[PDB]
Amino acid sequence: PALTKSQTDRLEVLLNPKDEISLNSGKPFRELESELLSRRKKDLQQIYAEERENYLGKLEREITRFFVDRGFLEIKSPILIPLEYIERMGIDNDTELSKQIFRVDKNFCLRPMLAPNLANYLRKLDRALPDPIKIFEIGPCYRKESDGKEHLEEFTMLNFCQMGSGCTRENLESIITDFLNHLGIDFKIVGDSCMVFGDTLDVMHGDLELSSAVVGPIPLDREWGIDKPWIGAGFGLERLLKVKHDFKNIKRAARSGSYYNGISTNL
Amino acid sequence: PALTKSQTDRLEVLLNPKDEISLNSGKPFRELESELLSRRKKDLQQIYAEERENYLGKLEREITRFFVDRGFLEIKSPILIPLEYIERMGIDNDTELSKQIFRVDKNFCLRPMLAPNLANYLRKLDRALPDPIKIFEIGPCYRKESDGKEHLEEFTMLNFCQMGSGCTRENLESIITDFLNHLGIDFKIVGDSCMVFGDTLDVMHGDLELSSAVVGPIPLDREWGIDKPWIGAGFGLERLLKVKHDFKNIKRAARSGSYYNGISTNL
Ligand SMILES: Nc1ncnc2c1ncn2[C@@H]1O[C@H](COP(=O)(O)OP(=O)(O)OP(=O)(O)O)[C@@H](O)[C@H]1O
Ligand SMILES: Nc1ncnc2c1ncn2[C@@H]1O[C@H](COP(=O)(O)OP(=O)(O)OP(=O)(O)O)[C@@H](O)[C@H]1O
Ligand SMILES: N[C@@H](CCCCNC(=O)OCc1ccccc1Br)C(=O)O
Ligand SMILES: N[C@@H](CCCCNC(=O)OCc1ccccc1Br)C(=O)O
Ligand SMILES: [Mg+2]
Ligand SMILES: [Mg+2]
Ligand SMILES: [Mg+2]
Ligand SMILES: [Mg+2]
Ligand SMILES: [Mg+2]
Ligand SMILES: [Mg+2]
Numbered sequence: 001p002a003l004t005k006s007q008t009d010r011l012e013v014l015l016n017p018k019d020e021i022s023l024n025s026g027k028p029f030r031e032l033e034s035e036l037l038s039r040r041k042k043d044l045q046q047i048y049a050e051e052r053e054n055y056l057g058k059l060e061r062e063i064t065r066f067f068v069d070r071g072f073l074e075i076k077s078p079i080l081i082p083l084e085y086i087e088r089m090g091i092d093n094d095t096e097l098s099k100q101i102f103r104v105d106k107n108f109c110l111r112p113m114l115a116p117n118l119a120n121y122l123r124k125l126d127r128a129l130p131d132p133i134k135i136f137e138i139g140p141c142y143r144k145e146s147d148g149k150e151h152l153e154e155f156t157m158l159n160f161c162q163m164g165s166g167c168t169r170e171n172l173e174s175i176i177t178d179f180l181n182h183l184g185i186d187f188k189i190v191g192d193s194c195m196v197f198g199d200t201l202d203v204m205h206g207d208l209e210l211s212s213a214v215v216g217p218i219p220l221d222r223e224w225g226i227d228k229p230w231i232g233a234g235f236g237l238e239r240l241l242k243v244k245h246d247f248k249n250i251k252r253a254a255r256s257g258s259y260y261n262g263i264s265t266n267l
Numbered sequence: 268p269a270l271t272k273s274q275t276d277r278l279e280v281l282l283n284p285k286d287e288i289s290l291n292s293g294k295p296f297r298e299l300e301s302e303l304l305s306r307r308k309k310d311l312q313q314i315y316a317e318e319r320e321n322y323l324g325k326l327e328r329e330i331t332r333f334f335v336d337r338g339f340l341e342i343k344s345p346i347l348i349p350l351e352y353i354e355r356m357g358i359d360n361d362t363e364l365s366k367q368i369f370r371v372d373k374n375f376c377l378r379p380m381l382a383p384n385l386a387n388y389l390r391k392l393d394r395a396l397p398d399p400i401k402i403f404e405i406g407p408c409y410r411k412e413s414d415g416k417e418h419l420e421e422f423t424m425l426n427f428c429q430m431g432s433g434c435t436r437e438n439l440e441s442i443i444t445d446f447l448n449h450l451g452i453d454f455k456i457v458g459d460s461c462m463v464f465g466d467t468l469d470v471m472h473g474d475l476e477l478s479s480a481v482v483g484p485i486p487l488d489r490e491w492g493i494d495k496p497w498i499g500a501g502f503g504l505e506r507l508l509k510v511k512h513d514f515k516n517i518k519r520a521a522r523s524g525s526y527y528n529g530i531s532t533n534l
Contacts, residue, residue: 041395047340048396053331054341061328064320073314074321078522079346079407080369080377080421102347102371110347110371120524124532128308129315140346140407154347255345257387265391 001028013264014040017246037267044263055245055253055261056156059237060138063158066182070175072134072160073125077117079140083109085116090196090220097195100143102153110142113234114159115196119224122163126228132164138237140255150208152238152254161232169201169215172231176203176213185210185243196220203233205243211235268295280531281307284513304534311530322512322520322528323423326504327405330425333449337442339401339427340392344384346407350376352383357463357487364462367410369420377409380501381426382463386491389430393495399431405504407522417475419505419521428499436468436482439498443470443480452477452510463487470500472510478502 003011007029014036015021023032068074083101086109091097102110111117114137125133138158145151160175173189180187185205192202198218203211213233221227238253245262247253252262259265270278274296281303282288290299335341350368353376358364369377378384381404392400405425412418427442440456447454452472459469465485470478480500488494505520512529514520519529526532 044392044395045397052335052338052340054343056343057331057341061331064324064328068319071319073319073527074324075527076321076323076522077524078421080409104369104371104377117524121532124524124534125311125527128311128534130312142347154345255343257344257384257391260340260342260392265388267391267395 001026003029007033011036012248013266016040016043016262017248040263041267044260044267047261047263055241056237056255059241060156062183063138063179063237066179067136067160070134070178072136072162075118075121075135075137076139077114077121077137079111079142080104080108081111081117083107085109085111088223089116092195097143100145102142102144112143113141114139114157115232115234116224118159118161118232119226122161122230123225126163132162132166134160134162136160149249150239150242152250154255156237156255157234158237159232159234161230163226163228163230165229167216167229167231169231172201172213172215172233175231176211176233180210183240183244185240201233203235208239208243210239210243268293270296274300278303279515280533283307283310283529284515307530308534311527311534314528314530322508323504323522326508327423329450330405330446330504333446334403334427337401337445339403339429342385342388342402342404343406344381344388344404346378346409347371347375348378348384350374352376352378355490356383359462364410367412369409369411379410380408381406381424382499382501383491385426385428385499386493389428389497390492393430399429399433401427401429403427416516417506417509419517421522423504423522424501425504426499426501428497430493430495430497432496434483434496434498436498439468439480439482439500442498443478443500447477450507450511452507468500470502475506475510477506477510 003024008023011023011032064074086101101112104110118135118137121135122133140154141157142154145153187203187205187210190202190204192200194200197214200212200214202209211233216230238250241253242250247262252259270291275290278290278299331341353368368379371377385402385404388402389400407421408424409421412420454470454472454477457469457471459467461467464481467479467481469476478500483497505517508520509517514529519526
């Protein structure tokens, strides 16, 4: 008995990283599907009985506590933003990131990153708060993607940043190290570059990019009224969850009607 | 010395409910503005030094703990949804709620409510979880609005719901009473009606609608594969914050670059 592509795809939906089941051992599809359906129902019943917290919600809460306790102000800024912020961030009207923007109406878009709203907060808060200014945000961001195992069109970003004193590469690396040590995630730092910010310190878990981080100043600062040293980093929460839970596909971690805490809801 | 409309508007931005300052006492605008700027800087410095949590984030966390502890599963579902869900909810292509939808691309929109995603979860979870099924979600929703003192175009909804046993008007009212007692908010229940769900139990704080709640079944259920009794209610978090903090305008409570925890960021 050989399994079709449709049958293999169904069993993959129902399989979880903790299982050790051979799909092509010769056991018939009916028995493999029944076994995995029972395991997944049991898993969902246990979540309902004992935890009840959503992985993305819980991780946002965990990250929020970490940064609040370290002196960063928690921001919740608009997800629907002016389309003018795109050109103003140096996302040239050519393509790459520009073709990835979801437009809303004629003058708005869904934010593809948190940085512009955070830059506006740094500028405004510097007129009232003592040095250094430390803020962060966690929330939804949106990009059109070719959709692989590591990209979502609707994902969740953390961006923390600081402006004023202490905005050095060593302090940025120290914050990233404390943060990922808190989550229990091994990493290395590798140099990369991007169109918006220039040179980045990319935080890698193996071949998976968890974050890009930047040490300012950069030429873009003038356009946003930023006139002091700064440091910042952006992380994808679903990528963090993919590492934490050993998911093969980031879709297990996404906002979704198709998975609850990585368990298929098609049972 | 009389104040212009622009000067009055500026002082209103800087005024907070706890102040007792007459804007038109005859004191010159320069002194009223300087006094309010100092108070607001002091307020923001105190938040930065001692709390650091965003009002909307904190309230979402408080509400999440309440519902998780009462047996409801925490959901985080897509904000960008299929445009087909609009017609399928009975939002007729005429207008009213239909003209309020933000469209994205050609086949998507920003969700104007949480209900359709929650209906899909109830249906799917009923195939694996024991009766009754209890779930909730908190997150952003979007509607085009004439924009008054009680409406935002980008707001935050809580919707909790239950399907199976216990889906009575008395139990729905009991949950609403426990919830608003937990937040310390007085209310009454008044009947109303809406195009989507029919008769609603509206939760009122004075003339302010905090929620619409529904006791099913309703004719819409068949289109969503819902085939059991159910109850549910939707609340706006920014309206809850407006009551809690005595804000004159709901914009003080919104996701915004213009206010932080109700304090102007234009200082
Ligand atoms: N489409 C996406 N889905 C999930 N997470 C994402 C996506 N795009 C970015 N992120 C996360 O946000 C972080 C910061 O965004 P950044 O602009 O640096 O991404 P990126 O360099 O375009 O990532 P990649 O090179 O993997 O596309 C990334 O390191 C990643 O963790
Ligand atoms: N544009 C908005 N801004 C802020 N909160 C809102 C908005 N629309 C709805 N809500 C909140 O969501 C809850 C449930 O949504 P519902 O569809 O019942 O609103 P609604 O009846 O259209 O409210 P209203 O009659 O005030 O426009 C409302 O009771 C309200 O608390
Ligand atoms: N990995 C993230 C890294 C974001 C870092 C930016 N965070 C910030 O604090 O703003 C500083 C800023 C100043 C001036 C002009 C523009 C800007 Br932006 C990303 O590429 O999405
Ligand atoms: N005040 C909120 C009240 C929402 C209650 C709905 N919540 C739910 O659980 O779904 C049940 C459901 C079943 C079948 C077909 C459609 C649907 Br929807 C609002 O009007 O936004
Ligand atoms: Mg990319
Ligand atoms: Mg990259
Ligand atoms: Mg990057
Ligand atoms: Mg309305
Ligand atoms: Mg109403
Ligand atoms: Mg209503």
